């Protein structure tokens, strides 16, 4: 089997991407944030504290003839950005782009933190990291990909995120028309539960490539590119007037600037992030100070190849017995 679904930016900055997911019988379609940095499929629901729902579409398990309470199971998750959610668990039928999993754990939120409430466009998350990170207790549950894998034509999924435009998540096949050149594959460590890999270096604009190992994670659920302070300083030094602002919480730059590109290495291959991908717009409405899309990972504890990086590539998440990651230009 295979599946193919369009993923759409939630706003004009590409702050996140939503993908429609069918849950239950009859189908209830929710727009979920596909997150290769976590491993829970959770949704706003009829069980969510009413004051914490503000415009989201909810899953109502009582209206699904295939929903079953997973007795005794609870979940609770906290994300890198400080947000969180928790609740109980159903199993139900879940379909993405024509690919169906029966008996998928659907984690129903009883509580969500303010940032989730405040974002009316995201109805929940669909985790695509390794199932070892799944938070369901006392019996850990599998991700949608893990459940689908054996049925897929090939045990892979691909992320093709757009810049200021829709893109695609495919399951079970590689669309050879969706990228240019070849796909370069690189080793993955699953020891921390992430799609963790090592970039071979970077360049800023038309500058020379610096060969240096940068361990980090491929994370579709993180907006920005978080890299070591040395790398980030070298980038922003090429932008007149750019500075790190403790009050804003990262590097800012004059909105009048033209930003240089940023290149990262995948083996001997190179992925180029155009400068415009690095512009996240005014820090507050009407400001002429703009927020940068490349930020320091210092104090995160890990480098993160988030959407800013991934959207410059066609990315293969290869879930073979020994997982690997592939990157192509597009």
Swiss-Prot record:
Highest taxon, organism lineage: Eukaryota
A Gene Ontology molecular function term of the record: aspartic-type endopeptidase activity
EC number: 3.4.23.22
GO biological process entries: proteolysis
Annotated ranges, domain Peptidase A1: 17-328
Keyword set includes Membrane: no
Keywords: Aspartyl protease, Disulfide bond, Hydrolase, Protease, Signal, Zymogen
Active-site annotation: 35, 199
Disulphide bond pairs: 255-290
Reactions accelerated catalytically: Hydrolysis of proteins with specificity similar to that of pepsin A, prefers hydrophobic residues at P1 and P1', but does not cleave 14-Ala-|-Leu-15 in the B chain of insulin or Z-Glu-Tyr. Clots milk
Protein family according to the UniProt entry: Belongs to the peptidase A1 family.
Protein name stated in the entry: Endothiapepsin
Upper lineage: Eukaryota, Fungi, Dikarya, Ascomycota, Pezizomycotina
Residues of the full protein shown: 90 to 419 of 419
